Amino acid sequence: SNQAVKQRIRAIKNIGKITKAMKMVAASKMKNAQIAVEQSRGLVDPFVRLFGDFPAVNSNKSVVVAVTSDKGLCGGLNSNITKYTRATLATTESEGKDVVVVSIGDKGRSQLTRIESQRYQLAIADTYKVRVTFGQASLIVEELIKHNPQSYQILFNKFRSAISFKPTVATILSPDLLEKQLEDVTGNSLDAYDIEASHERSDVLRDLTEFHLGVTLYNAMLENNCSEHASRMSAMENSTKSAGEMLGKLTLDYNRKRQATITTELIEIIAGASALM
Amino acid sequence: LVPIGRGQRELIIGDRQTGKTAVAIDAIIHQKNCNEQVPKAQRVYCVYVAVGQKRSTVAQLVKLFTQTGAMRYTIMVSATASDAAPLQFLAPYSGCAMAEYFRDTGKHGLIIYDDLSKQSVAYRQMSLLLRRPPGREAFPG
Amino acid sequence: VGLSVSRVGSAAQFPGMKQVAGTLKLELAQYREVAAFAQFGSDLDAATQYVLERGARLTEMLKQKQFAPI
Amino acid sequence: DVFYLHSRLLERAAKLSKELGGGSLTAFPVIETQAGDVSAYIATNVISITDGQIFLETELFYKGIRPALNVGLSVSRVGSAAQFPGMKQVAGTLKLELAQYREVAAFAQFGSDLDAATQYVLERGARLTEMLKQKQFAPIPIERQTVAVYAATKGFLDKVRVQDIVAAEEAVISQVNPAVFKILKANGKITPALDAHLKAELRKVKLPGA
Amino acid sequence: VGLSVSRVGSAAQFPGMKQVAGTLKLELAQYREVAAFAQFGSDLDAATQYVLERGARLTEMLKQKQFAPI
Amino acid sequence: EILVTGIKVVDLLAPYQRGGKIGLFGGAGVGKTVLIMELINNVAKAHGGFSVFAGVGERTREGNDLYREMIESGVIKLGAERGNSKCTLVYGQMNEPPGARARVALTGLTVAEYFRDIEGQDVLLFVDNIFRFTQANSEVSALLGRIPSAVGYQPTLATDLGGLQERITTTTKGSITSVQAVYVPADDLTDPAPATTFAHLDATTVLSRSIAELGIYPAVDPLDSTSRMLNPNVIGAEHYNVARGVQKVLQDYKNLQDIIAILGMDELSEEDKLTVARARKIQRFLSQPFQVAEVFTGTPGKYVDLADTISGFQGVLTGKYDDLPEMAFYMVGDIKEVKEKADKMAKDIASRKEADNKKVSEELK
Amino acid sequence: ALTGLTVAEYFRDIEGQDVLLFVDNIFRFTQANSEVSALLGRIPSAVGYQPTLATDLGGLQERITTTTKGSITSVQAVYVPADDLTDPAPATTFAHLDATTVLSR
Amino acid sequence: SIAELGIYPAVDPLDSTSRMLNPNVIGAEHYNVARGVQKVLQDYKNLQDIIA
Amino acid sequence: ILGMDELSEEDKLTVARARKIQRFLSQPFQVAEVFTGTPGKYVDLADTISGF
Amino acid sequence: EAAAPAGPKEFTEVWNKKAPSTLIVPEFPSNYTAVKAVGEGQVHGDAFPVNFYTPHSILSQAQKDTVVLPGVDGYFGVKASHVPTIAQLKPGVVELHSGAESEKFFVSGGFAFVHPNGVTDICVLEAATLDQVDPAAVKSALAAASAAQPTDEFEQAANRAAIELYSALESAVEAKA
Ligand SMILES: Nc1ncnc2c1ncn2[C@@H]1O[C@H](COP(=O)(O)OP(=O)(O)OP(=O)(O)O)[C@@H](O)[C@H]1O
Ligand SMILES: Nc1ncnc2c1ncn2[C@@H]1O[C@H](COP(=O)(O)OP(=O)(O)O)[C@@H](O)[C@H]1O
Ligand SMILES: [Mg+2]
Ligand SMILES: [Mg+2]
What we know:
This is part of a larger assembly, with 1 copy of chain A (about 280 residues), 4 copies of chain B, 4 copies of chain F and 1 copy of chain J (about 180 residues).
Chain A: H1 4-32, H2 35-40, H3 44-50, E1 61-67, H4 78-89, E2 98-104, H5 106-112, E3 120-124, H6 134-144, E4 151-159, E5 165-173, H7 175-179, E6 194-195, H8 201-274
Parallel strand pairs in A: 1-2, 1-4, 2-3
Antiparallel strand pairs in A: 4-5
Chain B: H1 20-35, E1 44-51, H2 55-67, E2 74-79, H3 85-104, E3 108-114, H4 116-129
Parallel strand pairs in B: 1-2, 1-3
Helix pairs in contact in B: 3-4
Chain F: E1 2-3, H1 8-13, E2 16-17, E3 21-26, H2 34-43, E4 50-56, H3 60-71, E5 87-92, H4 98-101, H5 104-117, E6 122-128, H6 131-141, H7 157-165, E7 175-183, H8 192-197, E8 203-206, H9 209-213, E9 226-227, H10 232-235, H11 237-254, H12 259-262, H13 273-282, H14 306-318, H15 336-342, H16 344-347
Helix pairs in contact in F: 11-13, 11-14
The structure holds adenosine-5'-triphosphate, adenosine-5'-diphosphate and magnesium ion (MG) (2 copies).
Adenosine-5'-diphosphate sits at the interface of chains F and D.
Protein name (chain H): ATP synthase subunit beta
Family (chain H): Belongs to the ATPase alpha/beta chains family.
Subcellular location (chain H): Mitochondrion inner membrane
């Protein structure tokens, strides 16, 4: 009776303490993993300054990667990315082509194997378990060039600010398959560069697009990790204010039941004493 | 899950419109279904005590029992809501005295005191109007 | 099922049901054991997801209609 | 009989028939609640006696919104038939715009995110809210209320920032020529001859800020 | 510690304890407000982990066996 | 036998028996007079027999309103054509002393009992607030010299209410279809006066304060309203299965109500976010505009037939309307009118950018 | 508290001054009157306070006013039982308070 | 609560008390394993809320 | 949880005003100069309104 | 021939027609890139912008006047307007110059672009300056590298990379000027 609402008040009060702790844990994790995000932002732009940005290519085999998070209190992030993943995956599929869908983070595997299970070949988790490093992104990219696709769409949340996390799609073209061909206009746009490497340009572009896939995959999971912490910092803020509004309502209900209990027990005592007096 | 025994008192407790009467009715109907099968002394004779219920519900229940043939073994004691509070108070004892005939004479009885939460309210009415001092929720001691 | 008790327990039910009902009573305790851990979706090691359907099939087995005893 | 105490008192506030002089008696009982609890005994007694309610919220009152009328919970369905026409014309879209403004409550960018297509209803419901604020001991005639809310809800104060709608609506009342108030009170409705001169008067006033 | 009061207070304690316990109750209060973070794996900014280990050794400081006053 | 009222939540989830006692439980301002006026509007017109209205301790404003709205409806005719009137008003309203309010339900019952027993008719007995009978006996029993029972009521609550309510029956020679309003005293369904009268009803329609705070009218709680007609052997399995499915979805959304509060919808399973969206749909689809509520809302009334509700609630359950928005279901009659409101919501988000209406050359017109 | 009001009412009504009156714990005034009316055999009202709670408080709080000759101002220490502002003793006392000075730790 | 986990006898290990639970009475070796069981059970009772 | 460095200049100007506002609410009392030495201040209302 | 012009402007229409209209269009890394290759500028004389990059750090983003890079065909200096090149780098010392003063980072590999607008981009995985390397470890590491030669030629590819990097590092630490 009047004991259940008391322990329920205690439960909501400790949940509010827990979420206020988790909010500033995510605040500390966002504040330290922000400098790494801004440092990794430099290397992605010489390739898009060199190779450009060609999302709307016509490919025949394509690997689409959804960079999600691992822990599940992100508050509307991984659902946003699995929305954008099929929103751009249906946009670039009108040619009767092959698609391999890959997820980084097992909350992507909990959300993508029910929406595209026909095309889902790979699930990569435990990536943020200590930190993300370039050799880790390199191994993941080597698993992506295990298949031999013509393009790579990478879906992640760019850490724009501590409140805004723009979901982006980054595109990497296979060297011999589309990279020389999506630069062809009045000859070629890559012929202005004088190759100073060992072997021919079909291997320089191979090394460069493997490097470019690894670099944008490193920056993808790093930006997505910072936005995952920064959105968990806001979701736990909403959780504290919700478990504070709930505590403030349930305390008023407890005070009403408290006053009602004292009144009805006293009316029982007076009614039992007036029958004898 | 909660198997009854033959001399066991099992409480059917719940909130309103959750199916307490329904569990009791399936007990009585199943005893009709098994009485036509066992040799003459494993037969269970039911008594339904309907305290405080409205007279329409008792009419529906008698209609159901007589259309399923379960009224051959069932007594129904019916102290409805318009009856005086001593009749609702006393109808579980009347029904238990009717069903104790089968217990005392080697047969097997089964009794349902449907709305025993209403016999206590009728007893509280009698005891408060006989000016006995009230207690918890003004119930008697 | 957790709140409904009975004092006699065994020795006052069907023996054939007594063979097949203890493994239902304890398995529904396992099924209720995981219902407060089904709001997240982690689905630990095909155990907390296997009994999450096995007990859910048992509770559907225990449903029945009205005025129709078995 | 604490119900009968208030029921036999409030039933004497009647509108008599035409055989009995046609007189009337309006009642405003006042009920103080404890922590906004309207499930109290006496509060639920008098709610089930009186025709409408005027709920006043402590949250709005300590947010500067005075009169702090909870516009969702407050009703008056008997005097809704007896409304000033013209005010009835604009009050429909007034409380519909505030009704879809109450769907933007505590999640503009407080709750989860922002879609930012309903910024029009957000920055419109704010101006309708600060239109309805009013200071103490200064009651407004009804013809100057319906002109002020016509200027609010037709979009004639849509360009003004939220901080000076209190000055904008008193500038509307003081600057629009006082013939239209006499037309609106005597006709008792916004006639088709009157919305034209009203909209011609409402574009030629200097609303502050911006 | 947070709910135990003495309205006489520091006017009637040991003056050698009064200059040491004034630190003690302050950092015990600091430990009480940072009490959820003790159960966490992600360490915070070490102005809270410092008061966490300090308040833990201070609560273990004030333990006492029965019938052996000091 | 079923009595179709044309109200969606009443027809689907707790259907009314044609000769049974019907209770509308409410908490001071949730809408059990508007619901009983809509039941008079929908039921007492299509009924061929006589009606009685017992106004027991309600507003005299509403008594004059019902009298005038029955005179202009032709249900009450004044003067020489009085024999063609179909309704008898008996009024013991809340200005009367407690001895009058405690016995005026017996007057209304006696007028209905004459038409049941003697005339052999089918009667409708609307009692506005049968609670005030109990409350008036509670007022006079404090002075009769009795020891009070629980919350402050008389020790003879249940026998008083039972001796009144056992007279409102369908007998072998006539039927009284009685719709009673019950007031719950401080939004308390555990108060002894609602809890005593739950037992004398075939269909309870429990109205909720929080549902009305959502804006959903009539504010019928779908998981607190019951009926003895919700049974497959009386309404058929196609109605019973969709009613039990709607109740299952609404309960399975009620079980998520605090997780959605303290965590948000962002973390729920995608087999449960489907459940939450479907239940937010089928609890807007129980909303309905009334013909008696159109004077203070302006939206016209919607009578919905029973088969329309059963087909319209199969469709939201199976998933045939998962693409329509939630607010397309709010305050519409049928599942057809969801479709004409869903696309009208998509004209009006596109009609923002069509024209720039200016009015020229009318100053000389 | 009525003795203190009388000594202040001399300085108001006779001396013609602006008097302060410090009622230390108006709640203990309420609690003492609750005990008095319980000893006289009266039936308690809501949660257990006297039936005359509003009028026993108003007998004190209405003699603290400004008249034509002087005034009595009153700084009353308020205790709130069970951290409950809707408890009828602080709910009744707050109806008479014209200000509030909250001292924080 | 212990009996709803199927653990019988449903003795609350914390809420049970004895006068014999004293290191001078039953011995300090018994006393310390008793207090250690109660310590780990109270720590788990405090951790269940953050586990869920 | 973040720091005063990431604040706006107007979200540091309110901090710089509010700290000296809550310092300017302090006052040495005449009844404490018996044992705290600092003499007590009686502030008029006209000085208070202008000084804030 | 470019009759199929993919791009950020030409993904938007196929997205706005195929994808749902609730969503804003997803961003692209081109939207966060302020300086490009083909559109000229960025030299204004003897300066040219050098962006020396690692995955973990941004080592320089200022403007310089010459940078000498260890290409696979040997070292080569990049003046203010070099020819556009994509030069794969071997292990060696990248040397920046802004004038009289220079900073010398030893790199492990990578590439180095200079673009038709004169901006150059050095893209390496790990660049440690010569102060951070101790010479007693590179000698023993080359001794342990140029000794064990397994027949699995994946490991001899790794060994060739080892002896190349360590030898160029050892010649990079007696090459103080
Ligand atoms: N096993 C069942 N399956 C489906 N419906 C059922 C079942 N048992 C009961 N019901 C339905 O539930 C409703 C309530 O049943 P019942 O009258 O037995 O409950 P009760 O608790 O006795 O109610 P009351 O307190 O009003 O007497 C009935 O309308 C019945 O049709
Ligand atoms: N179906 C409805 N549609 C719109 N508004 C309603 C509806 N039912 C109730 N309300 C609102 O709730 C109020 C309750 O009125 P009423 O039925 O007289 O309450 P009570 O339940 O106390 O008799 C009405 O004034 C009306 O404004
Ligand atoms: Mg029953
Ligand atoms: Mg009413």
